[PDB]
Ligand binder design. Structure first.
Ligand SMILES: [Mg+2]
Length: 183
């Protein structure tokens, strides 16, 4: 079971590296890692488990955050009432196309690797298309908008050594960009 002690914190050099492309097929160990990442998120969102193991609730996790500098991510976004929910373990995800129009969460973002909150909007693309492999090496192509697009951009940023706060405007941190979508 992964817990908070497995998550490296801001300042750890692994968070600023560029993660390596996975060879397919994955090793059994690489499969287990990705499954465990997802299982962390499942745990983090279960109120009784998260309290018992001291977990902060998360909807995404990238391998560099557990000190594994490989291009794998897990995203687990529960149904927000629309019937839309997202449960994906992706290998070698890439954004192949995106909107010009931006989107932001109105309170900013948080990260399990960053112990203290950082104020400011994180403008990302409102719409993205991702091509990736799944854990068995089969092909996935996702079309995402709004909150799930944001989450996946945040996770993919970790693979390139980028943190959310890198996107914050130090002069006008809370000023929305013109025509950006508030999510
Ligand atoms: Mg993060």
């Amino acid at each position: 079971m992964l817990t908070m002690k497995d998550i490296i914190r801001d300042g750890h050099p692994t968070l600023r590296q560029k993660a390596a492309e996975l060879e397919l097929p994955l090793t059994k160990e690489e499969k287990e890692t990705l499954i465990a990442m997802r299982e962390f998120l499942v745990n983090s969102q279960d109120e009784e488990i998260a309290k018992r193991y001291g977990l902060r609730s998360g909807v995404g996790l990238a391998a560099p955050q557990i000190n594994i500098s490989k291009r794998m991510i897990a995203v687990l976004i529960p149904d927000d009432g629309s019937g839309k929910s997202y449960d994906y373990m992706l290998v070698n995800p890439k954004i192949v196309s995106h909107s010009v129009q931006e989107a932001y969460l109105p309170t900013g973002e948080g990260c399990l690797s960053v112990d203290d909150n950082v104020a400011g909007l994180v403008h990302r693309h409102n719409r993205i298309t991702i091509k990736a492999k799944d854990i068995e090496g089969n092909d996935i192509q996702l079309r995402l908008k709004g909150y799930p697009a944001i989450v996946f951009q945040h996770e993919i940023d970790h693979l390139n050594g980028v943190m959310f706060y890198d996107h914050i405007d130090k002069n006008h941190p809370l000023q929305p960009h013109t025509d950006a979508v508030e999510v």
